[PDB]
Amino acid sequence: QDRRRLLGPAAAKPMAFSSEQELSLHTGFIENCNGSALVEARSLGHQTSLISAVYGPRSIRGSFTSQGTISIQLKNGLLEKYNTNELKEVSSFLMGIFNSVVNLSRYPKSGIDIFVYLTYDKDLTSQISSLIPHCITSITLALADAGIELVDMAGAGEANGTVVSFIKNGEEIVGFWKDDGDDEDLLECLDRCKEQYNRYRDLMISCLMNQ
Amino acid sequence: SEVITITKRNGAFQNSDSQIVTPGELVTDDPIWMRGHGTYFLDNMTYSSVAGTVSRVNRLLSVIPLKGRYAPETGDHVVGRIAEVGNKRWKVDIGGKQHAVLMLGSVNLPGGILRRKSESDELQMRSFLKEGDLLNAEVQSLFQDGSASLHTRSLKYGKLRNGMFCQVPSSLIVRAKNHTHNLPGNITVVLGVNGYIWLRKTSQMDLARDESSWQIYSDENDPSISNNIRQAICRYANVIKALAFCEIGITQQRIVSAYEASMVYSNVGELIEKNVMESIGSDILTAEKMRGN
Amino acid sequence: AKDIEISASESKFILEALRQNYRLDGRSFDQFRDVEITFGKEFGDVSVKMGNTKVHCRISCQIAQPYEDRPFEGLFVISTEISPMAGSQFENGNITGEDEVLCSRIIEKSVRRSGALDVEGLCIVAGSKCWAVRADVHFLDCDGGFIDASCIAVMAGLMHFKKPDITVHGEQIIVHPVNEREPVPLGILHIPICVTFSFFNPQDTEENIKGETNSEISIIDATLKEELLRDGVLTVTLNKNREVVQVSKAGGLPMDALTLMKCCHEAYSIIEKITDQILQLLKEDSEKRNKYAAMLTSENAR
Amino acid sequence: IDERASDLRMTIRTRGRSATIRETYEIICDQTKSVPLMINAKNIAFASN
Amino acid sequence: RLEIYSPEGLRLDGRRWNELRRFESSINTHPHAADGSSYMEQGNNKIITLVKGPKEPRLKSQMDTSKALLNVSVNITKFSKFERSKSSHKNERRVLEIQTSLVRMFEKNVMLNIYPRTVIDIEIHVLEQDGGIMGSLINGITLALIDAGISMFDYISGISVGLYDTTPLLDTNSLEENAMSTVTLGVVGKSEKLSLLLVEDKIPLDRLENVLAIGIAGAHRVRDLMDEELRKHAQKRVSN
Amino acid sequence: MSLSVAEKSYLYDSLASTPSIRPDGRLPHQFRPIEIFTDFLPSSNGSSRIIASDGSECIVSIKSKVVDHHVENELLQVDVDIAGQRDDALVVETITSLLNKVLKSGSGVDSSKLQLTKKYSFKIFVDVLVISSHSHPISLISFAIYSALNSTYLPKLISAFDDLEVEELPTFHDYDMVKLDINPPLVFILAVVGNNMLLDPAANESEVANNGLIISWSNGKITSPIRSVALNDSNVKSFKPHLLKQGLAMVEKYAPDVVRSLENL
Amino acid sequence: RRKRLADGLSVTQKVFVRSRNGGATKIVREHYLRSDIPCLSRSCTKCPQIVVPDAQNELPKFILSDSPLELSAPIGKHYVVLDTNVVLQAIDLLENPNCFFDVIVPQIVLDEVRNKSYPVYTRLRTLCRDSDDHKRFIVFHNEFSEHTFVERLPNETINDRNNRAIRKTCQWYSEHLKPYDINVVLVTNDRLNREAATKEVESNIITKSLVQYIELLPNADDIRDSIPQMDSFDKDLERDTFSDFTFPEYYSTARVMGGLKNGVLYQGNIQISEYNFLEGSVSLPRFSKPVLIVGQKNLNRAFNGDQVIVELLPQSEWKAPSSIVLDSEHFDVNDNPDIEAGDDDDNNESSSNTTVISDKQRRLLAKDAMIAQRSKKIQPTAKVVYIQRRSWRQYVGQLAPSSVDPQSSSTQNVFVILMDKCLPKVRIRTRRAAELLDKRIVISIDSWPTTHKYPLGHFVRDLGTIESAQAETEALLLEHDVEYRPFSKKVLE
Questions:
Q1: Closest CA to G441 of G455, G457, G424
Q2: For chain D, does the N or the C end have fewer beta carbons within 10 angstroms?
Q3: Hey, of D18, D22, D23, which one would you mutate to test binding to chain G, going by the most G CBs within 10 A of its CB?
């Protein structure tokens, strides 16, 4: 047990155990939040749904800050299990992309609270590499819905556990991740992921066009 | 190697007398001396309080620190930066035991000489000087707190711009009232008493000795800094890290002799390597012995 | 948390009262307040009152897993968590917690580290099942006297306490009710009782430290104002066998070994007195619990 | 559980001091079959406010 | 199991009954980012200290007109034992207890009076312990503060005595710690006035003088190394 | 920030031009003076103290246990702990992740120099204490782990254990140690300020840089993890494919020399 | 490595690997070296200056003399140095003052023998203390002499170094003794020393057989005898195995069930004998006769009065009745408890009691065995193959004195000696050991492992002192399940 939460019997232990994808977007479907997005991706491999919610611009007064900042919580899925550290890494990754895409100068004393809910990931057949397009798709939508400034829509592909995020129509790269891909994938992946980004670009623009 | 320097060691964590460097040990029982700084007493028997030498500063034979935090005094001219901006004063970091104070009756301002500001607001203070900005300011009165009331009041005083930061211990530079001067290649060093060093291209205020009045605390980096200007500043700051390394005084002539000696090496990144920093300090000492001072 | 603001005149006055050899309570420097021990209607409920200083201790046991390093001992955990019923300088569990730690740590150093409660015999099954005994010390009123009172509250609490009679077969423990069979009292190896000497300077630190004079005002059993105002402390803990169980000295006025040991010697008389008082009070409450138990004796003569 | 579960060893604890070799029970769960929850239907409620 | 002593005056380290352990120290181990620093070896207790500050804090509540605020952080890493520390220790009572003891004690030894609106942070990183560690940590602090130019009255010197009935054994290791009652003591200056006496175990009151008296001698012996070390260093940096 | 507005523009100009001169004044292929000190714990398997030129200090320590590896899928555990930060601030745990992934088994590091028979692996407990930080630690930690893991001595097996030798726990020779050879990656950090790609940023450079790229060298080639990072919040920009391809090319050339100088002290 | 600290003081570090359950922990022991080691002897001229202050306020007195024991040439006047095997094999001769007059115990020797058997240790320390003018034991140290110190090299074992340290102690001390003409004889009983002498290595030592020294002396010649440790002895007394460890594993559950079905396993209550731990007898009621359970590994982790499943052995292996008596007073009383923690103490579940029993005990097992082969009444004989059912209870007992040091306040592993004589000596570990020695104790049993030959208990509670009549009356009440408390709150209703 603990003083902040009920944790039941503590000598108790867990149970031991025995474009190729479609992204369909949704926004503005739940309220107590400045904007929300929903991304569900279906593929042969795995089907996944990611919820995001973005809270604020919030004022953080009692101190003057040079410019605003972005704070990313990833929350462990209810059907996916990951180490806390990996979630931190990915939070750190996404922050550094968003730092580059969100313009921050129209908002003094700002903190923005971004929540990434990695709710459902299910296989019909690392892992954390694959859901990075979907996280980036979700969060961008949310910043757009709320009315937070952005340089270009952010969006990425995943080619062979390698994730490359671009802005400006494939022209500039705002981040690169390679983890357990093969040596010298560079050309295949960049070509393949450009296709992916241009393809999900317009999908996000068309979600934003129903409102 | 060619590309890296590694000082190589293995097998271990790392690599007489002097005048009273332990308090709890009997300096003097005389009741007329040892009344000042770095002592305490029961009776007149004074048992030290700090580590250092005994030596007569002022009128009193007194324990004098071996090394410690920068200590302000009246008449000093120091280079230092804003830590906090308030509704009535800036808190200035000089590298001391607490922060020094710089306030509105004590500040020249761009847009006139004192203009562009009609009321106190924390905003109006903040527009000129941001946290972390660097500026050369003179000691107006030293108070017994530690705190030092500073002032900027000339048109040479105020912001340091067009340069690169450098820094040392404050006891391995000469203590003088001023030490800010022109050096060859037409860069100017601005060198306080506190160890902070700015090295910039010779601008109007330092060029007028051989000004500005809208550029006193206004941000401006000239586009007219060129290749050879920048390299001069990298070489200059480096040779200063050689004399720093070698734990001797820094006088303006040592910098010019050092600068010239370093040119047997043709690339500027070769001058931060240890073997060379020892050669440069060895050259200067060798020059001091041959010359006679 | 918010602290009590006393005057300069108060600070001067209380020192001068010690200097001219009185106390506020009308006590002597060596006089300890009478502790009264009120045993509950349950085992291990003890109300411990010393004058206005009111503290309670309730003991609980539970079945618990030993620890990895020594699985041949059980567990003593002391909660000396404090809530505002004495001030507002103690609030919300831990919020500063300096005092929490020190009182908790000394009581552990007394009962578990040295022994004053058997721990070997707390293993029901070694490396599997043990008793965990939890002392939860809760102050309701305080007028200084903090460590002294807390300790007495821990040991009287433990002595009056009793635990389910258990039968093991295998690793299955049949836990037996306290009306079903009579619960078993804990093992006690010693009786630590603390005496906290609060030291007040008539000089200032600098004259003290390379002087050698003793003229330091030694008082025990400080008041609330005294607790705040003390320049230094010695907490020394003895058992009624001429051994010092634990000493905590770490900050405040320095003292010669002779003077420290003086302190110890004074405390040694005062702890037999408290120990005695505790013994005869326990007995008379026990007589009332024993009143038909005496009739139904199975230890009888042939 | 395995045959002679009551005599399976634990050798997980180390650096004691006795009781660093003992029996223990060890029980995996297998979800290749799962029997469904036995529940009291009458005691199902649904809330309001 | 094992001998702790013999009438022949040996141990299983091989020390004598008033012999000290290996005392090695050197100062200025971080002279590029820490105001004073020192490395302390006593035995295999390998302690590094850094003093960072005097510096003003940038929080107003930590500012104090009457004296500096002093912070002593005792950090104990996961490789100080022989095995990997499974537990969190930087959030444990045992360590907060050492913290509360070193701070209150050095708070009076150090003059904080001459550093108003300051915060000092003493940062004490243990690299290994092999027992006799509670007296060793005091000693490392003492060399750090004197190096940093932070004024003081005296050297506090920590020393441990383990009593093997009537036989007091000056300095200790893991065996001595775990096989009898140990006393830990500190003296400030060449005074007989004790700053710190800490006892975790039954020490008899009748023998209380025997263990302290040999320890106050034993302490003087530690303090002269500290001076010798320091003046050998100060002479070096005043020749140049 | 902690620098000046004026200082940051001078730097941006300095660095961003063709020569790319900087307070050290290095060409982009050069590295500051580092000092390797090793083997200072007789109690540990191996240990490492590395002092860098900005006055950053990491101390890296190697402890072990031998364990059955068929109940494990991890062999190397990094615990990172940065003085003056707690055990769960965002940067600390992100460093722990990076480092654990660099050192992940069968991925740029051996999982067969750590096994003494094909049932028993040694679980190496990497435990990292950063004594002072004010610049990024990961490169220095990478370099410290190299020297460490080539100073890692393990217990030498008493006798050649099989996996059917007698089916009891492996048991070590009393004194005799085996030298551990094993080639860990080396993490190298590249910095982009304009269209200029520079090896090894100093503190100063990190504060003006648009982005950097963390890449690693294992086994005579470049390999995963690859990660971009943004080394400020407030001087950040985007970058081009061609500059990312030039940073590949640069490491491939300038990495080998460094590994060979670092290997033998 | 060896590195100067101070005047005639230098330190060195010894780092070695200890394994507790795959633990792989390097242990660093700092070993201080000093030239200040006394020789303890009145033949030594400079030894007055060598001795140093101590806790007792005195310079250590001499106990070895200027006249030691004297034999013909080239032996002369001679100090006897004892090898590691010799201390175990020759213990009673040592306890006799009749053939061991002037004895040097190497400190390395004292370390090895204390770890195997802590009784042998304590007895020998007491012989040292109560030395006189005719049985004079000293320890000479040399782990801490800086002129008798040995390194540990790669590509060897600890036994090689241990023997080298003694060879080097003899030549050192025999050289220093030459102006006074006192020879050192190493009396050895280990094969590595005896054949090192034979192949020729050095010739600056007199090296003797255990038996050869004995057979010259006519006071012990054939009166007291000894064997090699296992250098040229191999057990045939009643043991056949070299190790006392390792009690069998039980028959698996269905393998029991199938044997009960097919009627090849029989079961009954093992009624152990009160005079023997090795002789247990089961009541199997398809016979009239007691069915004997004989020998350590046939008992199969028994406790008294258990439901035991037994399988019979052939008539070939069937014994006749045994006439001997064993108890916890005369047997296992120079065996010690397993050590499972410590930094220089054992960390293994073997090699603590490979053999450390006395000569008397060996001869009694042997004599049982000689009688047994002409004993008659050959009757059914078996091994317990399963414990169907347990009979644990709380058992009374008292704490063994020679498996503990009284001075020492340490967490000592020590035996409970039970007052029921149908179970052996029970291991416990307690930091109350001095306290508990005078008191009758209650342990219960936790388990018995399959790797040790003595149960694991834990201490429950204390009764009074052993002098106390009340305490004996109470222990006997506990044992026989007789409740003594007043009748409860509910009884009165």
A1: G457
A2: C
A3: D18
Calculate the alpha carbon distances from B8 to B1, E234, F50 in Å.
Answer: 12, 27, 11
Secondary element (H or E) of residue A197: helix A186-207
Way it was determined? cryo-EM
Q: Is G198 on the interface with F (CB under 8 A)?
A: no
Q: How far is F134 from chain E (nearest CA, A)?
A: 10
Instruction: Give me the residues of E, 166-185, that contact C with CB < 8 A.
Output: none
Which chains, if any, share at least 3 CB pairs under 8 A with chain C? B, D, E, G
- Of all residues in chain B, the one with the smallest CA distance to C209 is B42
- In angstroms, the CA A8 to CA A6 distance is 6
C128 vs D contacts (CB less than 8 Å): 19, 22
Tell me which H or E stretch contains C57.
strand C53-64
- Of the candidates B143, B193, B133, which has an alpha carbon nearest to the alpha carbon of residue B165? B133
Q: Indicate the residue of F81, F87, F132 with minimum beta-carbon distance to E30.
A: F132
Tokens of B114: 């004192």
How many Cβ atoms sit within 10 Å of the Cβ of residue A171?
12
Closest CA to G286 of G206, G150, G187, G382: G382
In whole angstroms, what is the distance from residue B140 CA to residue B78 CA?
11
Question: Which of A84, E158, C238, A16 has its CA nearest to residue D28?
Answer: A16
Identity at B56, one-letter amino acid code = R
Rounded CA-CA distance G252/D7 in Å is: 10
Chains D and G touch, contact meaning at least 3 pairs of CB atoms under 8 angstroms apart: yes
Is there a contact between E30 and F55 if contact means CB atoms under 8 Å apart?
A: yes
Deposited resolution, Å: 4.2
Domain residue limits, chain C? 6-302
Q: In Å, what is the CA distance from C296 to each residue of A35, C178, C180, G487, G492?
A: 77, 17, 15, 5, 8
Give the pair of three-digit tokens for residue F209: 């840089």
- Residue E84's SS3 state is coil
Contact C206 B40 (CB under 8 A): yes
Contact criterion met (CB below 8 Å) for G66 and G47: no
CA A204 vs CA A36, A209, B153, E84: distances in Å: 13, 9, 58, 50
DSSP symbol at G344: S
Shortest CA gap E205–chain B (Å): 31
Q: Measure CB to CB from residue G342 to each of E1, E4, E180 and give the nearest one.
A: E1
DSSP count for chain G of H helices, then E strands: 14, 19
Q: Which of A15, A16, A18 sits opposite D32 (nearest CB)?
A: A18
CA distance B123 to F48: 49
What CATH superfamily is the domain C6-302?
A: GHMP Kinase, N-terminal domain (3.30.230.70)
**Measured between alpha carbons, how far is A166 from A187 in angstroms, rounded to an integer?**
15
Q: B46: nearest CA in chain C?
A: C210
Cβ of residue E58 closer than 8 Å to a chain C Cβ: no
